[PDB]
Design a protein around this nucleic acid. Structure first.
Ligand code: ANP
Ligand code: MG
Ligand code: ZN
Ligand code: ZN
Lengths: 227, 632
DNA sequence: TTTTTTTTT
């Protein structure tokens, strides 16, 4: 039976998903000490979270009722549940995040028998370091830092899928952009001419991107350093 | 006329590592420290070896001189041979065991070598930068290799060179590519590309023979789990003042730093550097590739001369006498400088911070050795800056906005009080500074910050510095007919920020003049102080060591001292009301008392403040007060 | 081009 592995690491995808499904359906420990920005939800106006239930199962009710599309995942709760999964999340965020999402969407669909306009998305938080203490070992790992916002840019459109049209017979094809790259068609399957297509930019699909500039806090620093 | 038999050279190098030794200090045996460091690399407690070429030169081994000369003359090649011999030594130590996996590249290599399993194949498939994962650096101490920035010319390309200088500019650490790894789409093969220099060009088409013959047109995609990165940093280093020719300005040079030698320097440090001089890939640009760096600001170990003092105790009088022994007298002034070199404790009760360090202002008549004392303090302190009143702007003291003409960007540039952070700033000719330049230090002397809001910049900088200042009275001499406020022409807001204010007179007297003349003429005869009483005095190096030891303590105040301190403050504040020639007194005074008491407890190396230290602080403040009314 | 800053006359 063919099986999928993360390249060079021997992590298999599905065995993580089993444990994360258990975490979502079962964790209820920390709810005596719920935090200030996390203790309210809503169907309309505002409502208060109940202690006694599995916590993320309770938080999914907001996604059903108020149609919120994201979950804030406190990583301290996951570390309390299982360090063996917490280490994988921090070490490989670019590989495991596309599947813990799917576990959340599966549990939502099973619980409520319902679909939504966009997928429910994860946001892990509360993993702390300094901007100078980063090393080449930390590339593609999960980190958290703090500072003050000085400037924000205007929005940039970032394409996800282009749209080609044949110049000779007005046939049209979609083409996904992935790994930063698009693939251009060469032969028109309708009229059988070659090197024939032209990209139509405004028939294609884009996403939002923004740049934000962040500044060091001056408090922690050693002698003589500027922020 | 060239030698390329690498196996014989490897044999010589391995014989050096096997046979260098140092005798044990108890005489129990011999240490073989280089192979101990090799075994530390083998068990992965280490990342680099620093080799001293002079040890190779003075080893008791055949062809040792020839090996040292070959290393020095073609250092860029001999690094590879040293890495190869250390790799062979590591495998001989390790045997059939495996080194531990610690990072993702180690995990990838250990997994992939046994995927390949499931020496010719290993060496053909993998480049040696990827197979070997440690660093090798060289050093020299002999004066044959000492040069300036100015002297490094065309004869020095490819050679090992050593020098000494000051750091102007330094970048932050960045990831630098060493080996790229690519994988093919269709045929799942891998390409390894080592990178040399500051550029590389990625290959496009797959080279594997089956893919090429099938014409499968598989693209190559780069992967950063298999690729190798290394810490990189860039510096600019300037000539030291003694190295410059007569009537000339110092020159500068660019330095590239890799790996474990990064983050050893910041701006405002003096360094000793060993490295290799190279071009950039018919007229060429050049740089220096650093091999070893040493801070001369910095350099559980204790010297025997310090051990004698630490066993002796009662060191306060000797420590006071040891500050600038060429200068006769001024024992209490030297004690005040000794307290300013140490300082008190920082306090942060309930969010409110209080400054811990001590500020001293010296004044006096001309020719009474103020500049000599400031120069000795600047040599004695670890991190310190020296400025004059005329040569400095209020932007050169604090921080500046710099407009880069190449890019158009704005940036900040830290001044003297920023560079001296954690240390001492000496300000000479303090009375001749302009008022609008002088008023910049008001925030630094009490809040220890600099805050800026200009152009497109808004920040705060830390400036945790003590200030020692020297001046003349208001018309060049003390006038006994005018008041204290007329003699000391400073505003009260600035005057309250100094913990101690002193006056040093010069008055003619037929015995003291002869005694001073005897002392100065002896110094001019012999080049050293008289020491007619044959008492002990402390060297500058071990005095620096002792002050560095004193800074580690944080003695706590006894709550029994409360009534003595508070009653002293009230009694001090009575006189400023009921005097004919008063001075300004404010609530900062009692904090000054607490600072000086904790400073003398630090000098004693005790952990609890004594009433003796409180009394000595009161005695010094009384002396400082009495200095400002001579012959009254 | 116009704008903002720090040394010099
Ligand atoms: N007590 C002393 N012992 C030894 N040398 C002394 C003494 N008093 C003055 N000198 C010498 O006097 C010279 C001038 O020293 P200097 O430090 O410039 O005095 P000053 O206090 O700075 N005068 P000024 O800067 O004009 O206010 C130096 O060569 C000193 O060695
Ligand atoms: Mg002077
Ligand atoms: Zn067509
Ligand atoms: Zn291929």
């Amino acid at each position: 039976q063919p099986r999928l592995y993360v390249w060079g690491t021997r992590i298999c995808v599905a065995d993580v998903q089993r444990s994360f499904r258990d975490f979502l359906t079962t964790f209820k420990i920390s709810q005596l000490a719920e935090d200030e920005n996390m203790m309210t939800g809503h169907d309309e106006a505002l409502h208060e979270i109940d202690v006694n239930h599995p916590y993320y199962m309770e938080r999914l009710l907001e996604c059903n009722d108020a149609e919120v599309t994201h979950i804030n995942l406190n990583l301290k709760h996951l570390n309390a549940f299982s360090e063996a999964l917490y280490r994988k999340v921090i070490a490989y965020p670019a590989d495991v995040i596309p599947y813990l999402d799917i576990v959340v969407n599966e549990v939502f669909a099973e619980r409520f028998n319902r679909t939504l306009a966009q997928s429910i998305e994860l946001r892990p938080f509360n993993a702390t370091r300094n901007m100078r203490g980063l090393n080449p070992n930390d590339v593609d790992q999960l980190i958290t830092i703090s500072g003050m916002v000085t400037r924000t840019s205007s929005l940039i459109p970032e394409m996800r899928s282009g749209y080609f049209q044949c110049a000779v017979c007005a046939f049209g094809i979609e083409s996904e952009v992935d790994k930063g790259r698009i693939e251009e068609p060469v032969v028109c399957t309708n009229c059988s001419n070659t090197h024939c297509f032209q990209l139509v930019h405004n028939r294609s699909v884009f996403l939002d991107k923004q740049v934000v500039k962040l500044q060091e806090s001056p408090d922690d620093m050693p002698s003589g350093e500027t922020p | 006329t060239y030698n390329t038999d690498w196996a014989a050279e490897k044999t010589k190098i391995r014989s050096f590592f096997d046979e260098y030794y140092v005798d044990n200090e108890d005489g129990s045996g011999k240490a073989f420290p280089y192979r101990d460091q090799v075994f530390e690399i083998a068990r992965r407690d280490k990342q680099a070896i620093v080799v001293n070429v002079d040890h190779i030169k003075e080893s008791d081994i055949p062809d040792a001189l020839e090996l040292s000369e070959a290393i020095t003359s073609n250092t860029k090649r001999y690094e590879v041979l040293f890495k190869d011999t250390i790799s062979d030594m590591i495998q001989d130590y390790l045997g059939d065991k495996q080194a531990p996996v610690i990072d993702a590249l180690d995990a990838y290599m250990f997994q992939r070598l046994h995927m390949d399993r499931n020496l010719q194949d290993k060496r053909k498939k993998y480049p040696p930068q990827l197979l070997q994962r440690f660093e090798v650096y060289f050093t020299t101490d002999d004066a044959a290799h000492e040069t300036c920035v100015r002297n490094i010319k065309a004869t020095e390309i490819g050679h090992l060179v050593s020098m000494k200088g000051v750091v102007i500019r330094a970048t932050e650490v960045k990831p630098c590519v060493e080996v790229m790894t690519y994988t093919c789409d269709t045929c799942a093969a891998e390409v390894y590309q080592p990178v040399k220099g500051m550029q590389f060009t990625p290959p496009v088409n797959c080279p594997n023979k089956e893919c090429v013959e099938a014409k499968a047109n598989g693209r190559l995609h780069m992967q950063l789990r298999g690729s190798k990165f290394v810490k990189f940093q860039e510096l600019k280093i300037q000539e030291l003042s003694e190295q410059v020719p007569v009537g000339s300005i110092p020159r500068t040079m660019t330095v590239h730093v890799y790996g474990e030698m990064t983050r050893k320097c910041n701006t405002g440090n003096v360094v000793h550097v060993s490295g290799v001089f190279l071009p950039i890939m018919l007229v060429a640009d050049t740089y220096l590739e650093a091999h070893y760096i040493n801070n001369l600001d910095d350099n559980g170990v204790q010297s025997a001369e310090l051990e004698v003092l630490r066993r002796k105790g009662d060191n306060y009088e000797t420590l006071a006498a040891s500050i600038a022994p060429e200068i006769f007298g001024h024992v209490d002034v030297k004690k005040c400088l000794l307290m300013a070199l140490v300082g008190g404790n920082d306090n942060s009760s309930n969010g409110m911070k209080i400054r811990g360090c001590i500020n001293v202002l010296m004044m006096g008549d001309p020719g009474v050795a103020k500049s000599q004392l400031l120069g000795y303090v600047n040599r004695l302190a670890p991190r310190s800056q020296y400025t004059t009143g005329r040569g400095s702007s209020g932007v050169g003291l604090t921080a500046a906005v710099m407009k880069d003409p190449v890019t158009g960007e704005m940036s900040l540039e830290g001044g003297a009080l920023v560079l001296a952070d954690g240390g001492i700033c000496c300000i000479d000719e303090f009375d001749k500074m302009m008022d609008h330049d002088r008023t910049a230090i008001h925030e630094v002397m009490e809040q220890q910050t600099i805050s800026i809001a200009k152009a497109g910049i808004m920040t705060t900088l830390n400036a945790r510095t003590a200030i020692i200042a020297a001046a003349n009275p208001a018309y060049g001499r003390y006038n006994p007919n005018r008041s204290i406020e007329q003699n000391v022409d400073l505003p009260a807001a600035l005057l309250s920020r100094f913990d101690l204010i002193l006056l040093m007179q010069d008055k003619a007297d037929r015995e003291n003049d002869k005694i001073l003349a005897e002392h100065i003429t002896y110094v001019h005869q012999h080049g050293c102080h008289p020491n007619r009483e044959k008492k002990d005095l402390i060297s500058l190096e071990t005095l620096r060591e002792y002050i560095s030891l004193c800074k580690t303590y944080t003695p706590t105040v006894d709550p029994a001292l409360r009534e003595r301190i508070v009653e002293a403050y009230v009694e001090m504040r009575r006189d400023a009301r009921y005097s004919s020639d008063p001075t300004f007194v404010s609530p900062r005074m009692i904090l000054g008392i607490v600072r000086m008491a904790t400073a003398r407890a630090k000098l004693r190396l005790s952990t609890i403040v004594d009433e003796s230290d409180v009394e000595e602080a009161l005695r010094l403040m009384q002396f400082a007060k009495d200095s400002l009314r001579p012959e009254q």
